[PDB]
């Protein structure tokens, strides 16, 4: 699972940093300048000849280049078992969106000098190696917000609206462990990369009672330095407030009990004790019109241990589902030929609400589509 | 680490044995078999200059005309350059002027210096061009194993002076 | 199309010459036209990429993709000692797994032609016929439409699987064909032979390791048409992945194609012509066999023997034209998913996959793998009334 992210200045050729997360853990591995220079050189050779070198796959690993705008390029090496091109391309787009979120289009295009650019980006690795390493959310890969449905209570939205009116901002979001619990319509209408970047950014940030950080919106305000205030009233619970201790006690005091119900709701997404087929060991749903993602891994944790394995299977299956799909469904049964072994993965698109499922091998192959339709009908009233 | 990451771009003729002197300087990373297909070779050698662990991104360029326009892509953004030539070879002796004008027209005016490695030419003429084009000649040999790390240290010191100058 | 970028080329790694002209590293490149000059320029990128990925990754470069003029072109690699063969075709016409399969098949064919492919490309007298073969290769990959269009549509999948379209045979016909071929076996000795009828394999005794080479060589020259004369007397030396000469005979007569391999250490044509003439009494029976559950289509395949069974042209004659092409196109991606675990098994030496289509009528395009029993693959399109 060795992975290397290299950020290069296309106009000059000097790399910006060598962030890498070999083996999932944030290993501080420095990739030798041989390969960095060689990959940069092949990229400029292609650019000069009007041929964009996208990716090159080997049997062990996979390497990918791309050029954002005109002066910035990102390349990845990745030896993870089960890699496809689209995962790497989404990773590239998300890292670039994160960059323009943290440093903006200025100092990223039309670089006055790259040394101060690297010194400024020094304050930006943390989210990057959160991205590259093992992550509990797939919002990077699907480009959809990893929303978690609140406990069927409009009181959360009402309190958020009251907080927004008190603070004079339309961008306010209750987020637990990087999962968007609630947000105003303005936050929902936010641009595609930063809508998933901001909750992830806060999840990757160290836990502090209050934090003030400047960001730039890749959609709407690529240059305007919007300030983001993060307040962690409860462990693993956080409130984001964007602007272009008497701060929350006049609205969130009566809602302390539901927020308590949201402390374990983060890792255990979906409403607690939701009626679902017991054979499902991991659920993942998309709403493409609203770009809303729901990714839960622990509906039944006693069997098929190592939930990170379930996350990786669901991510790979989503990659293949996007490969084939882009009243349709597709399933993949993996494992040994021996009955009762392996897993099942199902995917169904219905009403632009593509939904994925991970199941124990005992599930009926004939009824896989029937079960997917049942799950879709059970999940459509949720959102 | 906060490496300065100064980028060398080295220009010669391809038949002067510059690859030999550069390999003698920096071990490990070579990437020697790329000058014939792309036109540039990428090497690195971190060096301790004035309390700074300066990283040296060397970009050797192909002297053949087959890779010239593509070579122009690798000059831009290079923090310093080095023009190599040989006392035995004749073509590089007049090609240094062309290489200097190309390298300054591509990226801009850079604090660089040239180097003669390893006769058909006279030292007085080399001093003549050196004084003509503002840089100082260096006497280098493939066997002496000296007068090169001083070149790189001096160029790194020039760039460090530039950075400490405009940082304030 | 012809104007669409595409190339096949044979560069030399470890360039150790003072000259750096195009011919210095390019042993052979096709086409020598305006559809490959750009890739002829990016050859340096290709060489640097191969060397770099050799250094960093212990494995060879499987493939790469390059965005030319707004469209992605897939390039497939193969690294030998001091030589690298490399092909490039558009993605919209040739998907990547298809490209890898075409590369492996073309390298097997070239090794079948003249020893190692190093001796195939190094020589100069074979350049015109190599150009002819690669022209056939590219015209088949890009313009398959040259009984109409059904074989071309089925190609996009059928070339991927090893084997030939095996025709189910009764006991008596198979027995008499086996007896006739053994009689044909009776200067050189006969390794084996294989008889194909109207592009359908009808009877083989040849080992699979040479039967596959026979099949791919015959196919690459469009020697297996459907509903197709003369006397094809192909008589040439081949090198079937196995010293001594390994000559090859291919005799054609009235939809009968008999391919027989010979070892070493019109003489062998008269008796095979007489055998074909005496077997001409079974053509009516085999045509009767060729003529005449919710399962719509199946491409059931076997691995150890190396054959696959598909419904006959008459069977597919009785939304079907869209059905077949969509089924094959999706089974290409399912094939990719299955070759992942196939190369995993080859390393050792996943279970299945399903799809819906409603381009109308459900489809359940299902691919199934069998590794615990004798390895084999199955691919079925059927209605969803019963599953």
Author numbering:
A (entry chain A): 8 to 251, 261 to 342, 362 to 418
B (entry chain C): 5 to 122, 129 to 178
C (entry chain B): 302 to 447, 456 to 495, 511 to 552, 556 to 569, 586 to 608, 622 to 648, 797 to 822, 827 to 857, ...
What text comes from the article?
The tri-longin domain (TLD) RabGEF complexes represent a family of RabGEFs with a unique conserved structural core. In each complex, two subunits that contain three longin domains (LD1 to LD3) each form a heterodimer, which is required for catalytic activity toward the cognate Rab GTPases. We here report the cryo-EM structures of the Mon1-Ccz1 and Inturned-Fuzzy core complexes bound to their cognate GTPases Ypt7 and Rab23 in the nucleotide exchange transition states, revealing a conserved catalytic mechanism with distinct modes of substrate recognition. Thus, TLD RabGEFs rely on both conservation and variability in the switch 1 regions of their substrates to realize catalytic efficiency and specificity.
To resolve the HsFuzzy-Inturned-Rab23 complex, we again used a nucleotide-free mutant of the GTPase (Rab23N121I) and performed coexpression in insect cells. All longin domains of Fuzzy and Inturned are well resolved, but as in CPLANE, an N-terminal PDZ domain of Inturned is not visible in the map. Fuzzy and Mon1 fulfill homologous functions and contribute most of the interface with Rab23 (885 Å2) and Ypt7 (1270 Å2), respectively. However, Inturned and Ccz1 also both make critical contacts with the switch 1 regions (428 and 469 Å2, respectively). When bound to its GEF, K39 and Y38 of Rab23 adopt the same conformation as the corresponding residues of Ypt7. However, upon mutation of either of the conserved residues K39 to alanine or Y38 to arginine, Rab23 cannot be stimulated by Fuzzy-Inturned. The guanine base stabilizing aromatic residue F34 of Rab23 is removed from the binding pocket, but in contrast to F33 of Ypt7, it does not bind to a hydrophobic pocket on the GEF surface. Instead, residues I33 and T35 interact with Inturned and thus fix the switch 1 conformation. A double mutant Rab23I33A/T35A showed increased intrinsic nucleotide exchange but reduced stimulation of nucleotide exchange by Fuzzy-Inturned. However, the ~5-fold diminished ability of Fuzzy-Inturned to promote nucleotide exchange of Rab23I33A/T35A confirms the importance of these amino acids for recognition by the GEF and for the catalytic function.
